[PDB]
Scaffold this active site. Structure first.
Site, mmCIF file in Angstrom:
data_model
loop_
_atom_site.group_PDB
_atom_site.id
_atom_site.type_symbol
_atom_site.label_atom_id
_atom_site.label_comp_id
_atom_site.label_asym_id
_atom_site.label_seq_id
_atom_site.Cartn_x
_atom_site.Cartn_y
_atom_site.Cartn_z
ATOM 1 N N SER D 135 0.875 -1.197 0.000
ATOM 2 C CA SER D 135 0.000 0.000 0.000
ATOM 3 C C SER D 135 0.902 1.233 0.000
ATOM 4 O O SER D 135 2.062 1.120 0.463
ATOM 5 C CB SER D 135 -0.948 0.000 1.178
ATOM 6 O OG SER D 135 -1.573 1.269 1.322
ATOM 7 N N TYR D 148 -1.734 -1.285 10.526
ATOM 8 C CA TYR D 148 -1.705 -1.363 9.057
ATOM 9 C C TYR D 148 -0.424 -0.702 8.534
ATOM 10 O O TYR D 148 0.224 -1.311 7.683
ATOM 11 C CB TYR D 148 -2.961 -0.724 8.472
ATOM 12 C CG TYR D 148 -3.117 -0.953 6.991
ATOM 13 C CD1 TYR D 148 -3.646 -2.133 6.501
ATOM 14 C CD2 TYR D 148 -2.699 0.004 6.068
ATOM 15 C CE1 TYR D 148 -3.806 -2.345 5.137
ATOM 16 C CE2 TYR D 148 -2.859 -0.193 4.702
ATOM 17 C CZ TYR D 148 -3.408 -1.377 4.233
ATOM 18 O OH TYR D 148 -3.553 -1.570 2.889
HETATM 19 N N1 LIG Z 1 -8.581 -0.712 -1.793
HETATM 20 C C1 LIG Z 1 -7.585 0.130 -1.604
HETATM 21 O O1 LIG Z 1 -7.671 1.324 -1.853
HETATM 22 C C2 LIG Z 1 -6.264 -0.401 -1.099
HETATM 23 C C3 LIG Z 1 -5.233 0.505 -0.771
HETATM 24 C C4 LIG Z 1 -3.928 0.055 -0.693
HETATM 25 C C5 LIG Z 1 -3.698 -1.297 -0.729
HETATM 26 N N2 LIG Z 1 -4.743 -2.185 -0.627
HETATM 27 C C6 LIG Z 1 -4.462 -3.600 -0.251
HETATM 28 O O2 LIG Z 1 -4.928 -4.455 -1.299
HETATM 29 C C7 LIG Z 1 -5.319 -5.726 -0.735
HETATM 30 C C8 LIG Z 1 -6.761 -6.012 -1.093
HETATM 31 O O3 LIG Z 1 -7.606 -4.897 -0.673
HETATM 32 P P1 LIG Z 1 -9.171 -4.784 -1.092
HETATM 33 O O4 LIG Z 1 -9.517 -3.337 -1.227
HETATM 34 O O5 LIG Z 1 -9.433 -5.772 -2.188
HETATM 35 O O6 LIG Z 1 -9.871 -5.261 0.266
HETATM 36 P P2 LIG Z 1 -10.572 -6.539 0.953
HETATM 37 O O7 LIG Z 1 -10.839 -6.099 2.353
HETATM 38 O O8 LIG Z 1 -11.666 -6.895 -0.006
HETATM 39 O O9 LIG Z 1 -9.473 -7.687 1.111
HETATM 40 C C9 LIG Z 1 -9.124 -8.785 0.266
HETATM 41 C C10 LIG Z 1 -9.553 -10.092 0.884
HETATM 42 O O10 LIG Z 1 -8.702 -10.513 1.987
HETATM 43 C C11 LIG Z 1 -9.501 -11.419 2.736
HETATM 44 N N3 LIG Z 1 -8.916 -11.765 4.035
HETATM 45 C C12 LIG Z 1 -8.639 -10.896 5.066
HETATM 46 N N4 LIG Z 1 -8.157 -11.479 6.137
HETATM 47 C C13 LIG Z 1 -8.107 -12.824 5.807
HETATM 48 C C14 LIG Z 1 -7.681 -13.958 6.533
HETATM 49 N N5 LIG Z 1 -7.231 -13.913 7.782
HETATM 50 N N6 LIG Z 1 -7.736 -15.152 5.906
HETATM 51 C C15 LIG Z 1 -8.197 -15.188 4.647
HETATM 52 N N7 LIG Z 1 -8.672 -14.204 3.885
HETATM 53 C C16 LIG Z 1 -8.578 -13.018 4.516
HETATM 54 C C17 LIG Z 1 -10.837 -10.695 2.847
HETATM 55 O O11 LIG Z 1 -11.874 -11.570 3.215
HETATM 56 C C18 LIG Z 1 -10.992 -10.125 1.428
HETATM 57 O O12 LIG Z 1 -11.717 -10.926 0.505
HETATM 58 C C19 LIG Z 1 -4.963 -5.614 0.762
HETATM 59 O O13 LIG Z 1 -3.616 -6.048 0.905
HETATM 60 C C20 LIG Z 1 -5.171 -4.113 0.999
HETATM 61 O O14 LIG Z 1 -4.606 -3.650 2.212
HETATM 62 C C21 LIG Z 1 -6.030 -1.762 -0.947
#
Ligand SMILES: NC(=O)c1ccc[n+]([C@@H]2O[C@H](COP(=O)([O-])OP(=O)(O)OC[C@H]3O[C@@H](n4cnc5c(N)ncnc54)[C@H](O)[C@@H]3O)[C@@H](O)[C@H]2O)c1
Ligand SMILES: NC(=O)c1ccc[n+]([C@@H]2O[C@H](COP(=O)([O-])OP(=O)(O)OC[C@H]3O[C@@H](n4cnc5c(N)ncnc54)[C@H](O)[C@@H]3O)[C@@H](O)[C@H]2O)c1
Ligand SMILES: NC(=O)c1ccc[n+]([C@@H]2O[C@H](COP(=O)([O-])OP(=O)(O)OC[C@H]3O[C@@H](n4cnc5c(N)ncnc54)[C@H](O)[C@@H]3O)[C@@H](O)[C@H]2O)c1
Ligand SMILES: NC(=O)c1ccc[n+]([C@@H]2O[C@H](COP(=O)([O-])OP(=O)(O)OC[C@H]3O[C@@H](n4cnc5c(N)ncnc54)[C@H](O)[C@@H]3O)[C@@H](O)[C@H]2O)c1
Lengths: 249, 249, 249, 248
Positions: D135, D148
């Site tokens: 991120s 985080y």
């Molecule tokens: N959306 C954004 O703007 C953003 C920003 C920077 C980086 N990210 C990063 O990208 C990735 C995906 O983010 P997203 O927006 O798709 O969110 P999201 O919350 O949909 O996360 C992806 C998946 O991880 C799963 N997960 C979480 N903990 C788990 C566990 N213990 N065991 C198994 N599955 C688990 C969740 O159920 C979810 O389906 C993450 O690493 C997030 O921090 C996202």
């Protein structure tokens, strides 16, 4: 006596703002300060601190040679150089004129290189030497419509590392400070002439974790530290003096 | 058919090394490529890929204007610019001559700025535009006796961010690659000149986690990616293509 | 009476190396120093400087609570915390055992977070507070077979920025130092037990522009500076104290 | 087909960037094993011809089981994507120690452990790739998000550590640092605000491109870094942030 008692210190752009604060901080610690500036009012800053003033257009390589020669002769030694002097040319790559762009590169990047070489030759004589470059948070990031300043401060950051490596064998440390928004006359003028001064200042303050503008004296303290033997294992470092500006959005 | 089918691509320094690999990779993906160089063998690179060659001294602002105008006319459109052309001037701040230092700044930093502005004017016409700057690991770090190259590649890194911000509203993405040691003719010449070429090459290889030199084609792939719509949310990025060089010491 | 006259300073891992040098530097500047360590010999460092010693396993959250409570009571106030204590677990991701990896994360990353929160609650009472985290050049880069240390020091660097933002409203500045190779007993032991001590030391020295190891006292000076009101506009900064290690290859 | 017949493990594949990554790999001919806590991951696997494993990545036994079972189901492992992540609201002052440790376990320890498990499976065929989803908040902090910030910081330097330690196994390890991406996670946060359009506009304005990213745009960067087009790229942290980290 003090941290720079009897040391010769060269400060570029010493007539006001951070450069003036740097010249004062060195003189408080017992330094013989030679400051240069394009502004003749730099004479009064030198008189008030017991230092020497040289009116110098740092755009001109002959004037840079003259400044270091005359400063060296006046002080009797060179221990520290501070490259503080800098200009900007408003505009993107789309808007900035090539001559204005080149002048920003000459003053902001070529002059610090050239002065560091000239000053380094004077620094072998006595004990060890130090150079501090005043960069900016805008040497590590860009902002809109400021290409020349962003490019030149970017170059100054990597030039600081280059000088650090090349001057280590001469026992010279080279470091930079990257100030955040500092309440120099230059910045207060920009704020003052904005459509809503209070709102402009508030918005600038809010970019810093400390939620205020820096004081020129706060940048001076970081420069004094990096120039001093307290920073004997610090070279090639870029120290943010930005109230947490670059630590978040 | 291909990723750049019918796109006009300008590549500076396309006569050999990474620039030649970039020009070939764009042509493989269906681009109309205009490459420039001081070296006449650029003519054969253009002939072999179905592109246009312009013999051009990028030091000269008139020749940069001429190159983009004539390239634009020959291709019928400009979609991508790659600023690949660069020089070095051996020496520390102590050793480098001011005119050689200024020429490195003009070719390595001012030319990419100027060409980006000229190219950007041609890019509004069709859909979106991309610029890729070839920087270096020596834009983010220094090495001994290479002040001009270190300073200019440092400036190029922050210029990439400046252009990214200022050209985003024109739907133009601006990114850079920071190659490690790449087995171009330039690097093989440097190696060949050493007392023990194989030992020099081995020492260079050992600085990379992958324990080999990069191929020009490997830098080309990163440039193609950053120039393409696959990188549609990537702007202002410096991508190391350095086999893990900058990930450790 | 000095830069920290009558200030309460908490130093973790104060029994030897950089922590001991930090405890001494604060005491020289008139601080009441509470240091903790797993090693009972830390008692003598406290006795010698007029400070308090607490034998504490910083892996255990109850012992971290006990340390700050007991230190606070003994000093009468908390003004500075230094998170200096750290461990390593040799091995890549492939080689390191999960419990050893988690203990490195607990001591190197969770403990500094927890101690910063505990200390911050004590820092409201009088005037302003400062935290300094001892990171490493290996928080900004990796080396082979040191995944836990690399990961935890990486986390500590961004935790320093997080604390800077979150504790600014409590008038607490949070910064880190990133030392290069420092000649503590820990490093001299590793060198001493190496196949060729002189060669190992020479190779480590040669990674630094200053071509020597740092002294623990040189890291102490940078910590004192960042903890002091001279660094009043410095928060969220990671200051290399590495003799130019991270400025080149 | 850039990944024709390659086995690809994607953590957190049930939605958002993970789902987009699993789809992009399958579009390029990969055999995809995705895991998630969310049962809707079953539908993502069915739709792309891949395998789904319901897995709590907090639990080291479940991480061992996931890689073993994925490896057996696919017949090979060529790529791992560490996409799964959680957050625990709060500063150092406000976050509870157990919640802080769970964020470290899922966001930092799990990627380390899965990278080691996956690396053992990757020696078998030709070369291997790992991509960590970090991120912009691995490189900078924001208010009230210590766990985080700390865990993504660790993930960035873990990426460099793995790059160095796995280079001898012909495994490249890189990270993407996304800006604000319009996943369901981000649209939920926006939707909850007093003025969702103003909140979204404020988020957009932090990017030079003045828009949110698409999950598919992060997927393309992951595909690139996982592919042989990135054969000289290892230990890199690639911002996919619309210029977020290039200015303030
Ligand atoms: N959306 C954004 O703007 C953003 C920003 C920077 C980086 N990210 C990063 O990208 C990735 C995906 O983010 P997203 O927006 O798709 O969110 P999201 O919350 O949909 O996360 C992806 C998946 O991880 C799963 N997960 C979480 N903990 C788990 C566990 N213990 N065991 C198994 N599955 C688990 C969740 O159920 C979810 O389906 C993450 O690493 C997030 O921090 C996202
Ligand atoms: N004030 C801020 O918010 C801020 C932020 C980051 C960095 N900086 C940097 O700090 C330094 C000092 O800036 P300041 O805010 O005090 O502004 P300033 O404009 O007052 O600059 C200081 C001095 O530089 C002198 N100078 C300019 N060109 C010169 C030349 N050719 N020859 C001789 N002297 C010359 C000016 O006359 C002036 O006295 C500069 O390097 C600036 O880029 C300032
Ligand atoms: N090869 C490496 O190890 C390496 C390392 C990192 C960065 N780089 C960068 O990659 C790029 C390509 O380098 P290379 O290894 O192919 O070397 P190179 O010396 O072959 O340079 C590329 C081309 O630029 C051309 N050029 C230079 N100045 C010019 C001018 N004024 N007008 C027109 N053409 C001009 C040269 O004629 C040459 O063909 C450069 O920007 C270089 O700094 C190279
Ligand atoms: N010396 C170097 O070259 C170097 C390089 C960069 C970073 N560092 C960092 O500088 C700091 C000081 O290290 P050093 O070189 O003085 O080494 P050191 O091993 O002497 O560590 C300092 C102290 O930490 C203590 N400590 C460790 N775990 C503890 C625990 N659970 N509870 C209480 N005390 C504990 C040790 O007993 C020791 O007294 C550490 O954070 C280290 O990682 C050192």
């Amino acid at each position: 006596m003090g941290l720079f008692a009897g040391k010769g210190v060269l400060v570029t752009g010493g007539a006001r703002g951070i450069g003036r604060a740097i010249a004062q901080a060195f003189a408080r610690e017992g330094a013989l300060v030679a400051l240069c500036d394009l502004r003749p009012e730099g004479k009064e800053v030198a008189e008030a601190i017991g230092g020497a003033f040289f009116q110098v257009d740092l755009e001109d390589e002959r004037e840079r040679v003259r400044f270091v020669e005359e400063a060296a002769y006046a002080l009797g030694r060179v221990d520290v150089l501070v490259n503080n002097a800098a200009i900007a040319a408003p505009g993107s790559a789309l808007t900035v004129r090539l001559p204005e762009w080149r002048r920003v590169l000459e003053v902001n990047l070529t002059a610090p290189m050239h002065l560091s070489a000239l000053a380094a030759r004077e620094m072998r004589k006595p004990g060890p030497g130090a150079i501090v470059n005043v960069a900016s948070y805008l040497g590590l990031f860009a902002e809109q419509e400021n290409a020349a300043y962003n490019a030149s401060k970017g170059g100054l950051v990597n030039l600081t590392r280059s000088l650090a490596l090349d001057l280590a064998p001469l026992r010279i440390r080279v470091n930079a400070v990257a100030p955040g928004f500092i309440a120099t006359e230059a910045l207060l003028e920009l704020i003052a002439l904005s459509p809503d001064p209070e709102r402009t200042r508030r918005d600038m303050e809010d970019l810093h974790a400390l939620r205020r503008l820096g004081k020129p004296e706060e940048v001076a303290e970081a420069v004094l530290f990096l120039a001093s033997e307290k920073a004997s294992f610090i070279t090639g470092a870029i120290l943010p003096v930005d109230g947490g500006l670059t630590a978040s959005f």
